[PDB]
């Protein structure tokens, strides 16, 4: 094995000296033995005179000039395959849940080239989620990226957990959840909640892998965690031909970590203090999430907007890769609508006749126009009453009230909290169900029959119970 010596320690930056022409490649992982476990360094530059500059994946208090440094021969590698499910993993691929070692069959490097141009799928296609609002109004692209917007108190984690559940039951695909700069308090909460919900089952089979790069880890760790999570997700695509979900919370935090690393390496910052490699850093991550001939990785990414400035370099660069957005809003939950998805704000590039068919598009567009006219008329309703409305208008407003409530849906994962059995509605059913409403075939049906149900048959069923 190749051996180096530490020559310099400055915070999270460490410099290592190796022997003549024995230097490890940039992005190789190096290892120092510590009384606790191991400090991993990633090679950033070749400084000349047989010295490499590295970024530490952990603290460097205690390092001594001259300490022995091992070259692992490759990039940081992570265990991959089915053995990662229900396990919590850190950036260097170690288990951090005290459940022993991940007896995986392979480890793969976290740095890998994106699928070739020729390897790309030639048509955008929909990933069916089983969630009505999403599938109808802002459908996810298969192998695409979706911006998830909304903070706490909007049932965000339940939304994530239903996608995990639905993709596994509908498409037989696993998920990887990556906390980038995650609050430790919230990883502990997320893990305890995944077990309560069933998406993780210690005694049985889990559906999701957890990879966490905590806020209190050094910039190099927080910048690479996304790639660690991504590699586990990629293996399911390439090796097992699945449609995989990859959750990144928060992608902004991956950006800031990259800013911090860059700054630490002495690079001159670009506009607004970001790293000069802002766009390529983003592309080296995002380009890997895509559809190949074997399968697909689809990524749902929580996006923070600095200062609410959408023109800020971080969101502007992120947004270039997004294909859809799911907007979770307090205004929707205050109305009692779950999932609390804003039906107007949520937008998808794939809402097009070319991709989803003419019917799907026409149905979706009419629904949006209905809710839009409803929104505008809210003001004159609040003071003048419903008497000041034309025949065509008072009917669409009545219909809007129903459409709005029909966009809600019980989730299978939330059954433990609610007692209400959950529904997974198929895309074909969602299109037909709403189409039938828009033409006026369920106008005689009371508004409460559309609340928290699945397909159109669930509406007819409930209406018969609520009358008799």
């Amino acid at each position: 094995p190749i051996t180096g010596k530490v020559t310099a320690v400055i915070g999270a930056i460490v410099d290592v000296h190796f022997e003549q022409s024995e230097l490890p490649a940039i992005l190789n992982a190096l290892e120092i033995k510590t009384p606790q476990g191991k400090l991993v360094l990633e090679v950033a530059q070749h400084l000349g005179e047989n010295t490499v500059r590295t970024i530490a994946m952990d603290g460097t208090e205690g390092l001594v000039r001259g300490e022995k440094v091992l070259d692992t021969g490759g990039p940081i590698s992570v265990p991959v395959g089915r053995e990662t499910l229900g396990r919590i993993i850190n950036v260097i691929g170690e288990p951090i849940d005290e459940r022993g070692p991940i007896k995986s069959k392979l480890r793969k490097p976290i740095h890998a080239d994106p699928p070739s141009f020729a390897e790309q799928s030639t048509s955008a296609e929909i990933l069916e989620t089983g969630i009505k609002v999403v599938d109808l109004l802002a459908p996810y692209a298969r192998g695409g990226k979706i911006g998830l917007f909304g903070g706490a108190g909007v049932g965000k984690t339940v939304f994530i957990q239903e996608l995990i559940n639905n993709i596994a039951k509908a498409h037989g695909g696993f998920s990887v959840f990556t906390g980038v700069g995650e609050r430790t308090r919230e990883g502990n909460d997320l893990y305890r909640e995944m077990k309560e919900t069933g998406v993780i089952n210690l005694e049985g089979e889990s559906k999701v892998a957890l990879v966490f790069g905590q806020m209190n880890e050094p910039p190099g760790a927080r910048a690479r965690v996304a790639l660690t999570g991504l590699t586990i997700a990629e293996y399911f695509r390439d090796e097992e031909g699945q449609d995989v979900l990859l959750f990144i919370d928060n992608i902004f935090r991956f950006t800031q970590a990259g800013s911090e690393v860059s700054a630490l390496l002495g690079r001159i910052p670009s506009a607004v203090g970001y790293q000069p490699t802002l766009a390529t850093d983003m592309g080296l991550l995002q380009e890997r999430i895509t559809t190949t001939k074997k399968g697909s990785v689809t990524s749902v990414q929580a996006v923070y907007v600095p200062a609410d400035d959408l023109t800020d370099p971080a969101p502007a660069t992120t947004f270039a890769h997004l294909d859809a957005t799911t907007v979770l809003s307090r205004g929707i939950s205050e109305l009692g609508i779950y999932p609390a998805v804003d039906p107007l704000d949520s937008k998808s590039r794939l809402l097009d006749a070319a991709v989803v068919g003419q019917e799907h598009y026409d149905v979706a567009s009419k629904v949006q126009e209905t809710l839009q006219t409803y929104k505008s008329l809210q003001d004159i309703i609040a003071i003048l009453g419903m008497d000041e409305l034309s025949e065509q208008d008072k009917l669409t407003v009545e219909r809007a009230r129903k459409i709005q409530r029909f966009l809600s849906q019980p989730f299978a994962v939330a059954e433990v909290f609610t007692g209400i059995p959950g529904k997974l509605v198929r895309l074909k059913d969602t299109v037909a169900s709403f189409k039938a409403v828009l033409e006026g075939k369920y106008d005689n049906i009371p508004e409460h029959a559309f609340y928290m149900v699945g397909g159109i048959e669930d509406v007819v069923a409930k209406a018969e119970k609520l009358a008799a």
């Binding site: 310099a8 320690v9 706490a152 430790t184 910039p219 800013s259 203090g273």
Partner: protein, 482 residues
Amino acid sequence: NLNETGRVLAVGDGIARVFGLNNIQAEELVEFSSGVKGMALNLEPGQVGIVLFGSDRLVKEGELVKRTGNIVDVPVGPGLLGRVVDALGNPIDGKGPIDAAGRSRAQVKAPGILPRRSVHEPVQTGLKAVDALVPIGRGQRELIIGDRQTGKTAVALDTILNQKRWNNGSDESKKLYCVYVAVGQKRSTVAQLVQTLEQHDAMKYSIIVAATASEAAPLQYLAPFTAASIGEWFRDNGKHALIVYDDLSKQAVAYRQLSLLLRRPPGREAYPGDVFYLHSRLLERAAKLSEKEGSGSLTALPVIETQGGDVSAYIPTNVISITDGQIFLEAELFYKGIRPAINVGLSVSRVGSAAQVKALKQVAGSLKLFLAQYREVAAFAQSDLDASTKQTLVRGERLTQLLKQNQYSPLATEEQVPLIYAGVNGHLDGIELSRIGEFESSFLSYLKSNHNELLTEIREKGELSKELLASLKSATESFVAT
């Protein structure tokens, strides 16, 4: 020697560059011929950059420098209670040596994903506005933020004064030991803070850690970490500690001084690219441990001073995103009479209900609403206004007035609930805006005189049966008419 010793190459601006010390550790403490100490932050190819703990007038080129073999640490344990120490845990109060249970490193890994448990026990601040609207749990990080002179310290201090209610008892699981970290403040200010805790018999369960404005920059940078170790002794031993970092703004500024003088690369506002990591390393150490690990707790109230209300500046951005919520103070409210000057619309507790006494939660739920609706219609406060909006104005003004609270006068939960109950349910609407203050006083003493049984049930059971509710309703209706 060249391995355990060094010669000074150069010295200036609190930095000394030293040759040798070949076997030294990153962040190891060192000792100069003259008696001054410092730590080795930069280990470079042929030299070591050491930041000094004292004046550099004491160091000269050529002078010998010795290792100590020790990463920076501090004495810890209950021996520290009621003591005032510097950043290294030296007594500065003239009260003799400190008895330590052991010694702990300044830099310690935060508890991981696994050994924690959801925040679920209150830190009762005693402040109506906070406990009702921005409830703090044990093991949470709640930042106190706002411009100079808006009452940030007062919120922390009131929270510390309040803990007597339980620290005077014998049940240790209810106790809250307090750690106050003075960073960059002037000595007399700290001296006065100490005199204040003393007058409210609150020192006896408090520890003051002081790295004041004239002390070297490395001491100001260390003091939060040192203090956290002091607080972690409580957490690690099935007890509960609260730590106030007053303030993290000035700590950042000390770290920036060392970083620039060691010639590390500057970024936004000339902060080094690990200033985020500085504060996140510090604040994730606040936690609520699992049963396996003794259920002990550390709760952090970090302070950040904004400039002209700018939460987008670099340091406020950092800390805001690290903590679990913000208590936001504002000058405009302060001048209005609203004190503590908490901007309710902008304050949050990410933990929320879980950290609230059920009794308070049963009345606070609708308080949040009535205030939200009040802020929307605020402008309508100037002749032709309909039924509903005139009402929202009547409650809003009175609920706002109930939340006014004098300094150094934290209130028990059982004193809090009857006041908010009265307000929220409308029993105050008939009373004129200027009399709400005298109402509070008289109503509490009337309840202590005639309905002490209800107060006692609130305190002991922490909840409100339908029987209690109706009793309260009767006691409130009774007093209003009188």
